[PDB]
Design a protein around this ligand. Structure first.
Ligand SMILES: CN(C(=O)[C@H]1CCNC1)c1ccccc1
Ligand SMILES: [Zn+2]
Length: 139
């Protein structure tokens, strides 16, 4: 689990979004595994505006942050799940690292802020849904 809180927005994995998320839906992309919901409290997270390919992500299944190199956001084939067990996920970044289902929502961050959230795992690769293109999150 985990979310990004920036201004009056909550960013979550679309597959973990709650009733309240969908009740206050701002934007969702099933191809990206992202949902943004509206919040009453003003969030204080900073979204990275950059093309960093290095950062640190939180891995709940190890209670540890890992520094990683990650690929630029791309259209990536993803398998096995129950929300979508096989399809192309867009705006996805991979790194070599540990991820399990429950690690989804872990934040990946660089010096410039939040890069994205853990979205996919399997074969020792961790997929992060990029948020850096969502310039609207900051206004
Ligand atoms: C196992 N796996 C793949 O098969 C991808 C890797 C690049 N193209 C196919 C995958 C997908 C998403 C996240 C982590 C791993
Ligand atoms: Zn950066």
């Amino acid at each position: 689990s985990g979310a990004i809180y920036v201004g009056n927005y909550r960013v979550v994995n679309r597959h973990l979004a709650t009733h309240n998320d969908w009740a206050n839906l701002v934007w969702e992309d099933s191809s990206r595994d992202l949902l943004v919901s509206s919040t009453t409290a003003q969030g204080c997270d900073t979204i990275a505006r950059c093309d960093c390919q290095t950062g640190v992500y939180y891995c709940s299944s190890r209670r540890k942050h890992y520094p990683v190199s990650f690929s630029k956001p791309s259209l990536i084939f993803v398998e096995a799940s129950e929300y979508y067990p096989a399809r192309y996920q867009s705006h996805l970044m991979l790194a070599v690292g540990h991820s399990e289902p429950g690690d989804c929502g872990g934040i990946l961050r660089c010096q410039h802020g939040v890069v994205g959230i853990v979205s996919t795992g399997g074969n020792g690769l961790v997929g992060f849904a990029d948020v850096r293109d969502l310039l609207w999150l900051d206004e």
